[PDB]
């Protein structure tokens, strides 16, 4: 037969709105991009993705939160010589610091006053401001080491809630509040006026509603505070004399987030009216007169912009923005109006939420804390498990023959026997307290009974017991970004597995002797791994979009000519291939897929010859077929020797900025 | 049946006037629509019916005008795009052959009023 | 509708008096103006009902090509017994 294709649009797995973008390292234009730069994206359903902007923005890790959890602000902290530290507020009274290894909170510091509305990090990163609902600004001593947080000082109180914070330096702390005012406190310890609010400024109020100052930044090249409020106006204030220099009436509704570049020649700003405005001071006359101009204005987002940030280095100068529509947008910093931009896909499934089983023609898919199963026929939803004893979900696998499902999150996992009772299923928990106590990242089913478990604390069990696993050399990037030496992937069928950690290490393991035989042999982050039983091979693909294969018991000649005979589609690819499998009718052809395309490479053929992180910066160290007509893509797989399963996505009020009518 | 005979004759290569005659033979409304729904392309049925309705814009048969109005109802996404060199003057001379009835509908309705008045007063004065 | 039955009978019966009157149009101007403005727009609503009826029977015949299909097409469902076997806290309970 020819390939018959099930273009499924059943799964309505929808992410949530980006509420906070942050960059791990600050800008430093005249030095190279550090190998430890990570962008962090906190959504509104409570999960924190961490992306690396090397070679078109791959996604390294994801830290999910559970039911009724959100995340409103998040800040990085990297004292030079120590590990990265990631703090985040939710809609609650605590700050939550996460250890990047496990993907769990390692500290929930309850701030001692009210519900936190904003968070900011000191310059030199030893103190932390949390601005709370009862008008307080609380200082948290951060420099005690990673994990230990102390209370320092509650600054002088006020009535209205402080909605945004910024620091001048180690010295002063600026805060925009919900009464339309902008206070300036002094956090300079061992002064006479420590903690008391030195100044108050009032923005031009709205006529028929209350005004809220939503975004405040400090501009260090000049000595100003930029501030966006809920009238749309953007004001620049001289810090000394605490007074306005110039006001622009830029947006039509609120200005939720605004940011600046390194040398403060530009200020970018955005809000609910979904345009991004650029205010420039680049002319020598502008710099000697201290006069910003409203330079430009772009309409790129669909609904809102709730978060904006900027990075600028020797081989990277981009501002990143995201909002109520769930996608990310990258623009250039010094070439905003002129240059190009890239709207990311709303999901790039580096961690999958859908898998199928060929027997019973069935497919399982898990959104937040519920799984669902349907069969092909049309299609019919046969069962679902809205387990609400759970709070957060993570990865899942089904037994071949479709008997037992296992769902698993970083706190526990749970296994359910299934029996098809006709037009429905019957699902029963089968108790195992070892599974109920273990942390699981990946479960991948050696047999109908045996599974292999990768724990969040780097343990590899075999249940239904222990694989010896050698240690990795801890270099500076491994001590800086503390999840690089963590097992991302493991793929197995028939007693032979292979694990993969993102330092460029991909290690096989025989399930019998439980010995490594390492084949690290790599240069950067590994996107996907699939084992070919034909050729006795492992197939790794890295973030640079190269396909390597190696043998087992280094790379084959097919790899050796394929890598540099690779097609132009792969050489101009933008979305990384997150899934590989092999064809079912032929044991040697392999069939892979990214988030916007589907390809298939042939095992023997070779074809003839004749807005990124682009610098000389290193990685994290110091017949051929191609289609894209199923581009909003979530997951693909096979069922039998002729058909294919292509499950994708399909689609909210927004500020109407109308197209010209004719 | 005879609709299939007319379909095969009009689809083979030739006999278009005889094809419209065989269409006028059985001449169902439902089969008239079905013969438009079945065929995927026409051999300038619009051209031959254009010249027929141009040479007789006043015929008592409703067959070819019924066929033209159902062709224009069901296939006019493609009659404006099949051909535009002879078809342009075809629709031009068809439109100028048919506009005169729009010019003289008021006088015919006037004469209909005349005659209804005359016949009703003649029925009225009927000599007891 | 109802009253012009009266006006056609007045012309038919009194067909001599108001042909012997010297200024017919000047004496019943309001009838002439009313009928002129009623019958002046007849080509316009001719074009209107041609264009309207064309689309009307166009969707009528296209929907009569499949008019029996929407009588048993709706096979929709709801939160069935999978929800009862789904509630894992209620599965520990009952």
């Amino acid at each position: 037969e020819r390939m018959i294709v099930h273009r499924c649009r059943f799964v309505d797995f929808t992410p949530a709105t980006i509420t906070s973008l942050a960059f791990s390292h600050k800008s430093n234009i005249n030095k190279l991009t550090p190998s430890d730069l990570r962008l962090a994206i906190g959504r509104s359903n409570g999960n924190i993705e961490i992306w690396n902007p090397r070679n078109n923005w791959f996604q390294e890790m994801v830290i999910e939160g559970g039911k009724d959890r959100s995340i409103e602000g998040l800040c990085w902290s990297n004292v030079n010589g120590e590990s990265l530290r990631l703090f985040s507020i939710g809609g609650s009274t605590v700050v939550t610091e996460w250890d990047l290894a496990t993907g769990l909170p390692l500290r929930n510091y309850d701030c001692n006053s009210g519900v936190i509305w904003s968070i900011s990090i000191n310059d030199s990163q030893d103190k932390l401001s949390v601005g709370c609902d009862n008008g307080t600004v609380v200082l948290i001593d951060i420099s005690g080491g990673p994990g230990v947080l102390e209370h320092d000082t509650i600054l002088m109180r006020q009535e209205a809630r402080v909605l945004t914070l910024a620091w001048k330096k180690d010295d002063f702390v600026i805060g925009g509040c919900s009464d339309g005012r902008i206070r300036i406190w002094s956090a300079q310890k061992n002064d006479e006026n420590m903690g008391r609010l030195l100044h108050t400024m009032k923005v031009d109020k709205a006529k028929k509603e209350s005004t809220l100052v939503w975004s405040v930044i400090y501009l260090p090249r000049t000595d100003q505070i930029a501030s966006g409020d809920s009238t749309g106006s953007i004001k620049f204030w001289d810090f000394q004399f605490a007074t306005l220099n110039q006001s622009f009436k830029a947006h039509d509704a609120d200005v939720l987030c605004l940011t600046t570049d390194t040398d403060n020649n530009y200020v970018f700003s955005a809000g609910v009216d979904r345009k991004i405005f650029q205010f420039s001071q680049n002319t020598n006359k502008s710099q000697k007169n201290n006069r910003w101009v409203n330079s430009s204005n772009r309409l790129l987002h669909g609904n809102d912009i709730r978060a904006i940030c900027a990075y600028q280095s020797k081989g990277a100068d981009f501002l990143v923005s995201g909002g109520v529509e769930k996608t990310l947008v990258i623009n250039s910093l010094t070439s905003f109006s002129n240059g190009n931009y890239r709207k990311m896909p709303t999901v790039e499934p580096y961690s999958k939420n859908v898998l199928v089983n060929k027997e019973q023609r069935l497919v399982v898919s898990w959104s937040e804390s519920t799984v669902k199963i349907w069969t092909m026929g049309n299609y019919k939803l046969v069962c679902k498990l809205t387990l609400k004893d759970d709070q957060n979900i993570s990865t899942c696998s089904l037994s071949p023959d479709g008997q037992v499902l296992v769902v698993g999150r970083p706190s526990t996992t749970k296994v359910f026997h299934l029996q098809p009772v006709g037009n429905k299923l019957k699902v029963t928990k089968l108790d195992n307290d070892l599974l109920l106590r273990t942390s699981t990242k990946l479960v991948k089913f050696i047999d109908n009974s045996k599974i292999v478990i990768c724990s969040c604390e780097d343990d590899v069990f075999i249940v239904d017991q222990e694989v010896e696993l050698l240690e990795v050399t801890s270099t500076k990037s491994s001590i800086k970004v503390p999840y690089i030496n963590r097992i991302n992937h493991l793929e197995v069928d028939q007693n032979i597995a292979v694990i993969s950690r993102g330092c460029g290490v991909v290690d096989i393991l025989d399930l019998k002797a439980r010995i490594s035989k390492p084949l690290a042999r790599l240069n950067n982050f590994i996107t996907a791994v699939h084992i070919n039983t034909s050729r006795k091979s492992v197939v790794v693909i890295t973030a640079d979009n190269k396909i390597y294969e190696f043998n087992m018991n280094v790379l084959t000649q097919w790899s050796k000519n394929n890598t540099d005979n690779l097609p132009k589609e792969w050489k101009t690819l933008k979305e990384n291939c997150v899934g590989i499998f092999s064809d079912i009718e032929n044991s040697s052809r392999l069939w892979f897929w990214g988030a916007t395309w589907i390809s298939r490479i042939d095992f023997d053929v070779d074809f003839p010859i004749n807005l990124t992180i682009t610098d000389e910066s290193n990685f994290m160290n110091d017949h051929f077929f191609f289609t894209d007509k199923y581009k909003p893509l979530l997951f693909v797989d096979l069922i039998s020797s002729n058909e294919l399963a292509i499950i994708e996505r399909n689609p909210q009020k927004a500020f109407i900025q109308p197209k010209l009518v004719f | 049946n005879i609709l299939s005979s007319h379909l095969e004759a009009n689809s083979t290569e030739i006999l278009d006037d005889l094809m419209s005659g065989s269409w006028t033979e059985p001449e169902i409304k439902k089969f008239i629509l079905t013969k438009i729904n079945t065929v995927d392309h026409l051999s300038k049925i619009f051209l031959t019916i254009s010249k027929s309705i141009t040479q007789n814009p006043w015929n008592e048969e409703n067959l070819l005008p019924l066929w033209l109005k159902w062709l224009l109802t069901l296939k006019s996404g493609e009659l404006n795009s099949i051909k535009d060199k002879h078809t342009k003057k075809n629709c031009k001379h068809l439109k100028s052959a048919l506009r005169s009835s729009e010019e003289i509908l008021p006088v015919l309705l006037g004469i209909q009023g005349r005659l209804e008045m005359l016949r009703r007063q003649a029925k009225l004065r009927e000599d007891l | 509708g109802p009253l012009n039955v009266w006006v056609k009978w007045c012309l038919i019966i009194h067909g001599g008096y108001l042909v012997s009157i010297p200024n017919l149009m000047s004496t019943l101007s309001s009838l002439h103006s009313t009928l002129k403005r009623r019958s002046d727009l007849l080509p316009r609503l001719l074009a209107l009902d041609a264009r309207l009826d064309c689309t009307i029977n166009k969707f009528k015949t296209l929907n009569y090509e499949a008019g029996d299909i929407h009588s048993s097409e709706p096979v929709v469902e709801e939160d069935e017994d999978d929800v009862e076997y789904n509630e894992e806290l209620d599965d520990a309970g009952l």
Binding site: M3, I4, R7, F10 | P57, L68, Q112 | -
Partner: peptide, 28 residues
């Protein structure tokens, strides 16, 4: 029948999406 022919001629004068699941094919 003249007003009928005239009405029809004048009519001639003034006369002058994605489902949730498909199944298709692609190249081998």
């Amino acid at each position: 029948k003249q007003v009928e022919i005239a009405e029809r001629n004048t009519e001639l004068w003034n006369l002058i999406a994605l489902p949730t699941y498909t199944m298709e094919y692609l190249d081998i």
